[PDB]
RNA sequence: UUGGCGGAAAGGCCUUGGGUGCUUGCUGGCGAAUUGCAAUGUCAUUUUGCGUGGGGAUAAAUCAUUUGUAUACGACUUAGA
RNA sequence: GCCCUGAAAAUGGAUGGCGCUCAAGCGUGUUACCUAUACUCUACCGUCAGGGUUGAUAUGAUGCCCUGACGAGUAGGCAGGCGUGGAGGUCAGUGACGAAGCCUAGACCGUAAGGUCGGGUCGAACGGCCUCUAGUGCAGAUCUUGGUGGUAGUAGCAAAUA
RNA sequence: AGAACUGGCGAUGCGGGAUGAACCGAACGUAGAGUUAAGGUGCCGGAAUACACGCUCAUCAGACACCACAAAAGGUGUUAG
RNA sequence: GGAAUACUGCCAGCUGGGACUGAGGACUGCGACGUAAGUCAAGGAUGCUGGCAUAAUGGUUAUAUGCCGCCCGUCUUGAAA
RNA sequence: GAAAUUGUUGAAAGGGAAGGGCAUUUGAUCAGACAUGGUGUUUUGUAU
């Protein structure tokens, strides 16, 4: 032979893991995030946009909407660590929000063969967006300048110190 | 906060200004210093002249052209004081030094720009009242700088033009103040005052 | 395809080259310990080369393991190949350097039949 | 640093696992290390340590 | 508007060091606006990106990013310690860097 | 586009007239989604090359020869349609 | 007390440097802050120590496993390994379909001595393991023999009339 | 130059004393995090151009143990007794 | 005369932010909450989600930058000499 | 048909040596994992 042999071979049976003791308690959200609060989106496609927060989803995400008629942000879910909760709050009693959940926003995962060499929206999704924002701008029109505030984007100006700024 | 910061060197103590400027240049700020002939050094004029003659006697004995070079202009005196505070033999120090320009007077690139001061290097805020101090233009002239009078004449012409500019600016400012005083006491102005503006 | 293992950690992946083996051609880079009385490397002055020591030893669970997770076993023929029949998740065969091409093709065919991973299945191949 | 009051990494100085490579003697020390581990009788430990010994420490009786 | 900045600018000052030995695994960041450790405590855990340009396009861009985060405060003057996935290249002593507002506690 | 002013490194500052675009000063209508819960998510300016099409202008220097106000050699200083 | 006089040496120069004057000096007090291979906690390597485990199946009881502590080093001791020429045994080992050798900012293993592979070149033998044996490992000895540089297209190739 | 006791260097890296066998701190497997020693925090250089009470102006100031020196005697300089 | 407050100390008082680590691998132990079934933060990390699936991470190598690094061997108390 | 030493070609760097250590940028270059058993047969070579 070229190499002689090993006297003992390791066994190939994989051992089972020990019983872990990590239960899943629910997420405790920070106190500023109550439904109906205006959030500033910090990252994403809609970064710097002001949206209204509706429902805390099951997978620790926040259901938000623009409303879509106001600034073009649809019914979406965002990560709670990537938003700034302002003190501006609109009443969200009168929305039908328990339709939306985790399996509502499914992606239909793409196969490996479908390679985009070069390069649509659900009708139920656009009608749900219409139903939600029709109730939302009814409350938005009460306080003055709120629609324009929600339409405008947020940015930091020269001299703005986020550790001193109030939201 | 600015791309370029322009420092009026008048009334500034040389070493304290040089330490502030060296730290700024190493941190990445572009600095230009104007009016280096009006920089101050603490201590009497005779003391600083003796110090310069002490610096001036040091030279390479076998060949004076490779020795320590004694630069006579006030801008170069400030540059010497600042290069001592920068690690100038490294690439980092060379880059930090090329982010810097020092001038006598205020040349026409910078005569229309805003000049700031550094209060932790200002003489009237740092020296005890009564302590004697030296003016760098006088010291440079005593040791061999040849251009004190031409800089003074150019500064006089610049100051005349700058006063003509400032009179117009002040008149326009009083018109603007009159306009927004008349446009105060309105509903918009009261709302702004409620909001803090 | 290999057995599950922890993440392989190499404590010191850099080669321990002998002092001044860059300075002189006659000094080969094979490691020797400096025995000199004044040697900065033996005395461990700051800024000098590190020396091999027992603290750099590999974790025993991941020692001798290739990045694929196997241990390399040199094989010269199909009879040496078949000693890894029941150990395909722990060992990978490497055909010896002096095996002819026409014996390499036989060894490769048998290894594909037996499911044994071969580390160098391109040696002496004709295309 | 530690102010060591004793030598570090010192061997016990007692011969275990006898220097002989007599296979029957190794079988005997295997049997008696089993007995000395699991019978709690001092005789087994004494004869195990005696089995380890060198020739000049085993004079004939 | 004419501004779109959602980060706070900072400068990369130096590595963590003693007088004559530097530790490249830790960088020191001067965030603008902050002057005390108490104000610097707001930015602990925030993400930091160093953004630079290259001649070669790699995966659809000529812009490359080094990611890291703020770990603790440094000194009495609001400088922070930051650690990056790969250490910063030391020619960026004096280069700008971006401190984002996420992960947010507001 | 009109008239100025600026030489410290001016190369910038001010002004007249008309054209054209925008205007969030105020009130409306439509759009935005799917980048899927973040990924700088690419918007800057520096140099150069190669093409179009539209202007513009048509040289010298060196070697070799020559001089001796120069000269170790180079270099210098002269001359030659 | 501080300052000043007393206070003179040879290249140009040193509170480390710049420079600093209600100090960036001197005396004293209070905090905050910086960072050593030290201290604390954790991982991994090794060493030492104390223990567990012959039961069946499958192997290695010098095996596997549990627990604690420890790690500086010339001269020097000891131990476990790596490599070379040759010898007994074995792998019915490799090889003209290419052995050995050599080259290779190509790959992999080992803390390391080293080991392995791919590619090029090449042409006739060589290796793994268990043991035996030695004329067995080089950077130095103004070492030995051989080969080759920089110096360097340099010193120079100018006595005896042409 | 020669003794005593102890601790060291030789045989020893590391942080500090710019620099240095012996001083100060601390003794060393390979790494991570935290806290410190001695020494420091204007800038070189990581870290308060911190806070507080005074003293000092030198036409050779002074600036930190080992340590890289200064004395007798003087001064209506100024300060407190 | 009646308090308050400072300072110092104690709590097996409550609570927010940040960082580094996730060794082990069936069960066995000590506990806690429950009448019970059982559950648990109690002898070492799991759950949910995304992008990529390639030179992107990574390795090697040349270079750049920050800080550090004197020539080996030898005799010697002491070697870069 | 090794090395010292040398030519050519290519690449790279170079303000009074060069070489080295830790760390990353940049350029170049490169290994590894990508199937897995699987409900299943939307099936051809009818059991692939
Ligand atoms: Mg060599
Ligand atoms: Mg020695
Ligand atoms: Mg004196
Ligand atoms: Mg100091
Ligand atoms: Mg003090
Ligand atoms: Mg540390
Ligand atoms: Mg034991
Ligand atoms: Mg220890
Ligand atoms: Mg022989
Ligand atoms: Mg061959
Ligand atoms: Mg080579
Ligand atoms: Mg032949
Ligand atoms: Mg011999
Ligand atoms: Mg030799
Ligand atoms: Mg030797
Ligand atoms: Mg010789
Ligand atoms: Mg000649
Ligand atoms: Mg001659
Ligand atoms: Mg000795
Ligand atoms: Mg010592
Ligand atoms: Mg600093
Ligand atoms: Mg007195
Ligand atoms: Mg208290
Ligand atoms: Mg790469
Ligand atoms: Mg990489
Ligand atoms: Mg690289
Ligand atoms: Mg290199
Ligand atoms: Mg370097
Ligand atoms: Mg150095
Ligand atoms: Mg002597
Ligand atoms: Mg031949
Ligand atoms: Mg060669």
């Amino acid at each position: 032979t070229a190499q002689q042999a090993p006297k003992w071979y390791p066994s190939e049976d994989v051992a089972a893991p020990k019983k872990t003791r990590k239960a899943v308690r629910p997420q405790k959200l920070r106190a500023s995030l109550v439904p109906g609060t205006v959030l500033i989106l910090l990252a994403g496609r809609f970064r710097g946009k002001r949206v209204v927060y509706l429902k805390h989803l099951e997978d620790n995400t926040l259901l938000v909407t623009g409303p879509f008629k106001v600034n073009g942000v649809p019914l979406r879910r965002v990560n709670a660590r990537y938003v700034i909760a302002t003190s501006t709050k609109v009443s969200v009693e009168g929305v039908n929000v328990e339709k939306f959940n985790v399996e509502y926003f499914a992606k239909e995962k793409l196969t490996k063969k479908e390679k985009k060499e070069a390069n649509e929206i659900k009708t139920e999704r656009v009608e749900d967006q219409k139903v939600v924002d029709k109730a939302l701008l009814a409350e938005i029109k009460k306080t003055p300048l709120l629609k324009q505030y929600l339409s405008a984007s947020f940015s930091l100006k020269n001299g703005d110190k986020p550790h001193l700024l109030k939201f | 906060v600015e791309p370029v910061v322009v420092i009026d060197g008048k009334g500034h103590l040389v070493g304290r200004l040089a330490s502030v400027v060296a730290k700024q240049l190493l941190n990445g700020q572009k600095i230009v210093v104007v009016r280096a002939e009006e920089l101050n050094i603490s201590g009497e004029f005779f003391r600083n002249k003796l110090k310069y003659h002490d610096f001036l006697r040091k030279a390479t004995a076998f060949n004076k052209t490779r020795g320590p070079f004694h630069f006579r202009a006030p801008s170069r005196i400030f540059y010497k004081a600042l290069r001592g505070m920068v690690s100038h033999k490294t690439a980092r120090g060379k880059a930090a030094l090329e982010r810097l320009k020092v001038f006598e007077g205020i040349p026409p690139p910078y005569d229309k720009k805003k000049r700031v001061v550094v209060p932790q290097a200002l003489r009237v805020l740092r020296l005890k009242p009564g302590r004697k101090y030296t003016t760098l233009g006088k010291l440079s002239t005593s040791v061999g700088w040849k251009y004190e009078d031409v800089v003074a004449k150019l500064e006089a012409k610049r100051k005349v033009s700058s006063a003509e500019y400032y009179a117009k600016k002040r008149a326009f400012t009083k018109k603007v103040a009159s306009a927004n005083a008349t446009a105060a006491e309105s509903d918009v102005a009261k709302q702004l005052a409620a909001l803090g503006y | 395809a290999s057995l599950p293992h922890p993440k392989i950690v190499k404590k010191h992946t850099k080669k321990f080259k002998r002092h001044h083996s860059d300075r002189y051609h006659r000094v080969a880079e094979n490691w020797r310990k400096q025995k000199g009385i004044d040697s900065v490397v033996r005395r461990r002055f700051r800024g000098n080369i590190s020396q091999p020591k027992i603290g750099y030893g590999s974790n025993k669970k991941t020692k001798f393991l290739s990045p694929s997770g196997h241990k390399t076993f040199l094989v010269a023929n199909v009879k040496d190949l078949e000693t890894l029949t029941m150990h395909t998740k722990t060992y990978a065969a490497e055909i010896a350097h002096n095996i002819s091409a026409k014996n390499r093709v036989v060894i490769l065919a048998r290894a594909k039949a037996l499911g044994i991973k071969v580390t160098n299945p391109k040696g002496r191949l004709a295309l | 640093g530690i102010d060591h009051t004793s030598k570090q990494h010192k061997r016990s100085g007692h011969r275990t696992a006898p220097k002989s490579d007599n296979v029957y003697l190794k079988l005997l020390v295997k049997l008696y290390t089993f007995l000395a581990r699991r019978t709690d009788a001092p005789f087994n430990k004494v004869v195990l340590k005696a089995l380890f010994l060198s020739k000049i420490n085993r004079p004939p009786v | 508007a004419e501004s779109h900045r959602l980060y706070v600018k900072g400068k990369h000052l130096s590595y963590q060091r003693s007088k004559r030995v530097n530790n490249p695994n830790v960088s020191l960041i001067k965030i603008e606006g902050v002057a005390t450790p108490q104000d610097a405590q707001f930015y602990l855990g925030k993400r930091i990106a160093y953004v630079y340009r290259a001649s070669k396009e790699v995966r659809g861009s000529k812009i490359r990013v080094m990611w890291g985060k703020v770990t603790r405060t440094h000194g009495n003057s609001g400088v922070v310690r930051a650690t990056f996935r790969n250490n910063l290249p030391a020619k960026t002593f004096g280069a700008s860097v971006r401190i984002f507002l996420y992960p947010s506690n507001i």
Side-chain angles (χ1 to χ4, degrees), chain C residues 10-25:
Chain C
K10 314 288 197 176
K11 286 173 179 166
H12 197 271
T13 180
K14 201 182 174 191
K15 174 153 287 289
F16 294 93
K17 297 178 181 189
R18 186 183 174 184
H19 194 59
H20 287 345
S21 49
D22 62 298
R23 195 176 177 91
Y24 306 101
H25 186 278

Side-chain angles (χ1 to χ4, degrees), chain E:
Chain E
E2 69 188 359
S3 76
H4 305 84
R5 189 167 49 83
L6 285 175
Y7 57 89
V8 189
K9 43 195 55 170
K11 289 307 222 153
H12 181 212
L13 303 182
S14 73
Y15 292 141
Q16 172 184 59
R17 54 182 297 167
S18 75
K19 196 198 299 296
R20 298 206 163 129
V21 161
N22 56 28
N23 169 38
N25 296 314
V26 170
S27 285
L28 307 186
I29 307 300
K30 175 68 212 156
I31 310 167
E32 75 162 40
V34 64
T36 71
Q38 285 77 24
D39 315 323
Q41 277 281 333
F42 169 82
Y43 297 92
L44 299 199
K46 296 289 187 297
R47 300 269 147 70
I48 297 170
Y50 172 61
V51 170
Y52 58 103
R53 301 167 174 281
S55 180
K56 183 176 78 173
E57 181 176 280
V58 289
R59 265 168 183 248
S61 180
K62 305 221 209 184
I63 294 164
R64 313 193 187 168
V65 189
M66 311 205 68
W67 278 106
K69 54 173 182 313
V70 181
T71 56
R72 45 185 293 178
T73 69
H74 188 73
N76 292 321
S77 298
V79 187
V80 298
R81 299 187 202 182
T83 56
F84 290 77
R85 204 193 151 262
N86 291 342
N87 302 336
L88 291 185
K91 64 202 191 63
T92 75
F93 289 164
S96 295
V97 70
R98 312 183 189 182
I99 298 104
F100 293 98
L101 302 178
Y102 44 84
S104 163
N105 284 111
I106 302 299

Side-chain angles (χ1 to χ4, degrees), chain C residues 17-93 95-118:
Chain C
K17 297 178 181 189
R18 186 183 174 184
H19 194 59
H20 287 345
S21 49
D22 62 298
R23 195 176 177 91
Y24 306 101
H25 186 278
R26 67 176 180 264
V27 179
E29 301 190 355
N30 294 318
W31 174 258
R32 302 298 190 254
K33 197 175 185 63
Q34 296 298 128
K35 263 80 77 177
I37 60 174
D38 296 340
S39 180
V40 289
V41 172
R42 186 190 59 78
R43 290 206 260 163
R44 298 195 216 107
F45 274 92
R46 183 185 66 198
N48 286 104
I49 60 161
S50 67
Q51 298 182 301
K53 38 177 65 174
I54 204 57
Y56 290 119
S58 299
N59 190 333
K60 287 190 296 302
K61 289 179 187 288
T62 51
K63 200 162 164 175
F64 309 109
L65 287 187
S66 296
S68 68
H70 302 84
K71 284 152 151 263
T72 293
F73 184 69
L74 267 185
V75 290
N77 60 6
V78 295
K79 195 176 159 305
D80 300 354
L81 178 62
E82 288 160 341
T83 81
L84 312 177
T85 313
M86 310 320 315
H87 320 106
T88 60
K89 313 185 90 43
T90 61
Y91 284 81
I95 307 178
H97 77 294
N98 45 2
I99 309 299
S100 49
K102 72 166 176 56
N103 293 332
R104 274 176 210 260
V105 65
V106 180
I107 294 173
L108 273 177
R110 189 82 187 104
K112 183 211 212 304
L114 293 174
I116 312 175
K117 164 179 185 59
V118 174

Side-chain angles (χ1 to χ4, degrees), chain B residues 1-120:
Chain B
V1 63
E2 321 165 29
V4 190
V5 183
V6 191
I7 310 185
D8 194 0
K10 175 183 184 292
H12 281 86
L13 299 173
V14 166
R16 301 191 174 261
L17 186 62
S19 69
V20 174
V21 170
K23 199 48 188 184
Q24 289 293 306
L25 277 297
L26 292 157
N27 286 346
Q29 177 60 59
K30 282 199 184 55
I31 294 280
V32 63
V33 173
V34 303
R35 285 218 281 186
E37 78 278 356
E38 301 285 72
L39 274 156
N40 288 155
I41 318 170
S42 64
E44 208 170 347
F45 169 76
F46 209 95
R47 268 201 77 81
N48 290 108
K49 205 197 199 310
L50 283 178
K51 272 182 163 64
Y52 207 98
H53 285 315
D54 214 316
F55 163 63
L56 190 49
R57 63 179 271 104
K58 318 195 181 335
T60 292
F62 60 93
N63 194 343
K64 259 75 174 178
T65 56
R66 53 210 291 163
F69 301 117
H70 317 96
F71 282 87
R72 259 77 155 181
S75 60
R76 317 298 315 154
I77 289 179
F78 185 41
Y79 188 84
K80 191 242 185 180
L82 190 153
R83 193 178 65 108
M85 316 203 193
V86 183
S87 179
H88 69 284
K89 278 179 186 172
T90 64
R92 174 166 164 274
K94 282 177 188 53
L97 283 180
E98 72 206 9
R99 309 178 189 112
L100 168 76
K101 300 152 160 181
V102 187
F103 298 100
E104 291 96 39
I106 315 185
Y110 308 101
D111 62 358
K112 316 287 197 54
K113 294 291 188 301
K114 170 71 168 175
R115 274 89 64 186
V116 303
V117 294
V118 186
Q120 50 171 352

